[PDB]
Structures are given as C-alpha cells and as structure tokens.
Design a protein around this ligand. Structure first.
Ligand code: HEM
Ligand SMILES: C[C@]12CC[C@H](O)CC1=C(C(N)=O)C[C@@H]1[C@@H]2CC[C@]2(C)C(c3cccnc3)=CC[C@@H]12
Length: 466
C-alpha cells in the first residue's frame, strides 16, 4: 500500500560503463532496432538494423543529411564550417563536391595516386628496416607515411625526414581527439555543460596551433598558385573562389575543409593499420597464409602494386574483416533530420538527432556467422578464389549523401601499406609476451591501445638480394 517514488529521470543503462555503441546494441534485445532518448529538449534516435539504416542513409538520405550542433564540434570546425561537421546546406554541398572533385584528378597520370603512396611506403619500409630485430610502436612511422601522402594531395608538398612539424601535428591531433569528446561522440548526459571543467579551454588551444599552422600554409600558397595548374586540393578550392558563391569560399571555409581532409587522411588510416597488425598478431594462422599468398602471387622480383588486389584476395578480405569488426566510426558521425520524416513508418521530427549503430549492423548474429570472430574467410568463396559480399549489413564507409569522400584513398593506402610490410617484414610478438588489447578506445575514431611489435626483415626478402 506504499506509493512509488516520483521519477525525475531515467536512462536505459549506466553512463560511462562499457562502450556506447555496444550498450545501444545490447539494448536492442529489450526495445528493438529503433528507439529514442530525450535529453532536455534534444531527442535522439538510434538505429541498429540494416534495413532501417539504409532508409536513413539512402532512401530518405536527403532528409537525414544534417549534422547536430555540439559545443566541441563548433570549435574544431570553426563554427560548423567544413565538410564533416558542417550542417547540410550551401557550404557543405559545395566543399564536398570540390573535395570529391580533387580525388578524381588522381586517375593515372604524372601523379597517379598509387605512385604517391608507394613513394612514401618505400621510405617507411626503409626506416622500419633499421629496427631489424627490435620491438617498436609503429604509430609514428606510419603516421609520417600517410601524413606525407595527404600533404601531397592537399599542397603537393611533403615533409623531410625528421621535420619537427610532424611531431607538432601529432601533438595537436592527439589533443583535439582527446578533448573533442570523452569516449564516443554520442554522449547521453551533457557532462561538460553541467560541471566546471577545462575541456573547451584545452580544445581551443589545440585548435589554435592547428589553425595557425594551416593558416601559414595557406598564406604561403597564395604566392605559388597559378590558375593554369590545378593539381592539388588547395588549387581546386582557390580555383573555385575566383570563378565566383564567394561568401561560401572565404579563407576560413578553405582552412577548415583542408583541416577536415588533412585530419581524416592521417588518423583514420593510421588507426586501421594498427588495428590490422593487432589482429594479425592474434591470428598467426591468417598471417602465415598471407605470406604464402603474397609469395606465390607477387614474390620478391618486384614490389606490390595496386593491380595486385586481383591476386592478393586474402589480404583484401583481411582489410574488409577489420573494417567490420572494428569500424573506424562504429556509430558513423551523428545525423540530423532536416525535415519531418519517418523511419520504419515511425515519425521523426525536424531537428531530431539520428545515430546509425554500425556496430550493431556488423555484429548482428542473423546477418553474420559468428560475428565477434576475426574470419577474413567470410569474404571469400569456399575455394578462396574470389571475393564475395556475404551480408547486406555491411557499410564500413557509410552510404548516401554523407558517405566517405576518401574511401578510394583509404582502400589503396591500406592495401599497399599491408602488402609492402608483409612482403618484407616478419611481424611477431615482442620479447615480452604482451599482445595488443583488441578492446579498443572509442573516441571520435575507434582507436587501438598503443602496442609494440617485433619487426624482422624476412629471410626470403634477404636471399632475394643476391
Ligand atoms: C579506413 C578508413 C576510413 C573509413 C572506414 C571511413 C568511414 C567513414 C564513415 C563511416 C563516415 C561517416 C558516414 C556517415 O556519417 O554517414 C565517413 C565520413 C567522412 N570521411 Fe571517412 N573513412 C575513412 C577514411 C577517410 C579518409 C582517408 C578521408 C580523407 C579525406 C575521409 C574523409 C571523410 C569525410 C570528410 C567524411 C565526412 C563527409 C560528410 O560529412 O559529408 N575518410 N567516413
Ligand atoms: C579529429 C580530426 C583529426 C585530428 C585533427 O587535429 C582534427 C580533426 C579534424 C579537423 N577538424 O581538423 C577532422 C576530423 C579528424 C578525425 C577524423 C574525422 C573526425 C573524420 C572521419 C571520422 C571517421 C571516418 N572518416 C572520417 C571526419 C572529420 C575528421
């Protein structure tokens, strides 16, 4: 005969316990593949089935192409300018098209995308070879390689070995990623609006070093820009300013688009490489089969080529399986409803935040055989002769208006970095028994805990030098 306590708030699970993308997933067993949460006035919908996800991303793509406003993303994007964190509208559509246009320039020519990548990988494999017999963290060497690539794609410039500017870029990259969000971008409770903290203070300072550095590059480039030479992204963006839309192509607009491209080009790829090495250290059977495949298909007469993706199918599968088990963005980047719409015939109102739980799509037990397993074989027919698409619930690069604009660069960097390393190096467990933790660290990107790997030059790659 006792009364029930008045309830002021309620959340499905504890905050800051487990990974958000996995807590939403576990929650589907209670409430289904689509449900909503209310935080004050803000409403958020989480979608964990491929059918509903393809509706949000593709079929109704234009309706759910907005980006919500976050205090941190404002600072990082210079008030919602750029591509990734910009709302759907004039700025985003223009710059995304220009950035996409830039990548199209890299069909075979004097700067074929493969040759830029290979030029930097040869330097990487040379540096790593000097550590023959030692255990090292490959974060920075790989960071340098991909930084020089995207730097060439953006400014036709690279960094000389040992340039301190690289160490400066790494510093503010780790600083922004750290403070851009505690754990995932999706944050149930707005902790930084509640308690006194220094998060935005710290974030602004790392953004100042980033903005100042890029502002130096841009100003210097106004002197080198010639309209008759459009070979990099900064040319494309400047070429567009003159033609005018000039209010959409100010210096601050160009700054952020380069920042978005510059940032995503180094951190996403560096992360996926580290993830792949981690899985290969936990699966020596796979790693052994990858050496055999590359020995019988590429050998040592030459270095790997992008065409070799026709031969090295277990490698393409491995990369596919990593992008599945540990997606770079397990919950994509939050979407926002631009207008009143629906998902699964449920109503969704304008301004409502919408998150696609890609982690749920890649771990759904009905669409995948033993989804929590690392099985690159699942992307190959039973004969290991050609690649397959075993499930329709697989969107490593997203889909629709907001899909990845650098997917091409990503797949090529990943395939070539892994191909060059496997040809030349034995990548074994360090002298201490430590294996990397495959748990992961959910940030704006799904990072892996730093770890060491014992690198040795392969006996076969050596004998082939006589
Ligand atoms: C393995 C590497 C990568 C993976 C798995 C990946 C995947 C993704 C995903 C899931 C999204 C969000 C999709 C959505 O919000 O619906 C995205 C967006 C984006 N990606 Fe990537 N990406 C990778 C690398 C790159 C690279 C190398 C670039 C180079 C420029 C890049 C640039 C972008 C940008 C700018 C966006 C936001 C576009 C927009 O908001 O319209 N990404 N990517
Ligand atoms: C966080 C980071 C990297 C660190 C840099 O100092 C600041 C930064 C970006 C920036 N505003 O300069 C763009 C972000 C990128 C991280 C990757 C991001 C979030 C990204 C992305 C995330 C996941 C998959 N594909 C692309 C789109 C925008 C990119």
């Amino acid at each position: 005969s006792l009364l029930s306590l008045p309830l002021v708030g309620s959340l499905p699970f504890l905050p800051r316990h487990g990974h958000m993308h996995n807590n939403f997933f576990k929650l589907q067993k209670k409430y289904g593949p689509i449900y909503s949460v209310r935080m004050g006035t803000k409403t958020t919908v989480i979608v964990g089935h491929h059918q509903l996800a393809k509706e949000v991303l593709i079929k109704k793509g234009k309706d759910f192409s907005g980006r919500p406003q976050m205090a941190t993303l404002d600072i990082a994007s210079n008030n919602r300018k750029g591509i990734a964190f910009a709302d759907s509208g004039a700025h985003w559509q223009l710059h995304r098209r220009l950035a996409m246009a830039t990548f199209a320039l890299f069909k075979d020519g004097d700067q074929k995308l493969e040759k830029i990548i290979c030029q930097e990988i040869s330097t990487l494999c040379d540096m790593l070879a000097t550590h023959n017999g030692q255990s090292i963290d490959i974060s920075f060497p790989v960071f340098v390689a991909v930084t020089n690539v995207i730097s060439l794609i953006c400014f036709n410039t690279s960094y000389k070995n040992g340039d301190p500017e690289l160490n400066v870029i790494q510093n503010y990259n780790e600083g922004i990623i750290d403070n851009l969000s505690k754990d995932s971008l999706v944050d149930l409770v707005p902790w930084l609006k509640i308690f006194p903290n220094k998060t935005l203070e710290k974030l602004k300072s790392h953004v100042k070093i980033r903005n100042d550095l890029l502002n130096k590059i841009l100003e210097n480039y106004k002197e080198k820009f010639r309209s008759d030479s459009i070979t990099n992204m900064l040319d494309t963006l400047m070429q567009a300013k003159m033609n005018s839309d000039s209010e959409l192509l100010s210096d601050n607009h160009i700054l952020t688009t380069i920042g978005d491209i510059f940032g995503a080009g180094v951190e996403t790829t560096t992360s996926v490489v580290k993830w792949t090495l981690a899985f290969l250290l936990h699966n020596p059977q796979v790693k052994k089969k990858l050496y055999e495949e590359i020995d019988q298909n590429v050998g040592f007469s030459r270095t790997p080529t992008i065409s070799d993706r026709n031969r090295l199918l277990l490698l393409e599968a491995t990369i596919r399986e990593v992008l599945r088990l540990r997606p770079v963005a397990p919950m994509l980047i939050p979407h926002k409803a631009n207008v009143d719409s629906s998902i699964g015939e449920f109503a969704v109102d304008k301004g409502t935040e919408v998150i696609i739980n890609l982690w749920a799509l890649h771990h759904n037990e009905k669409e995948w055989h033993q989804p929590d397993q690392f099985m690159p074989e699942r992307f190959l027919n039973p004969a290991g002769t050609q690649l397959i698409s075993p499930s329709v619930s697989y969107l490593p690069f997203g889909a629709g208006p907001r899909s990845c604009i650098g997917e091409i660069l990503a797949r090529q960097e990943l395939f070539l970095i892994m191909a060059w390393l496997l040809q030349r190096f034995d990548l074994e467990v360090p002298d201490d028994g430590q294996l990397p933790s495959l748990e992961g660290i959910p940030k704006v990107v799904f990072l892996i805990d730093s770890f060491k790997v014992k690198i040795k030059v392969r006996q076969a790659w050596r004998e082939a030098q006589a």
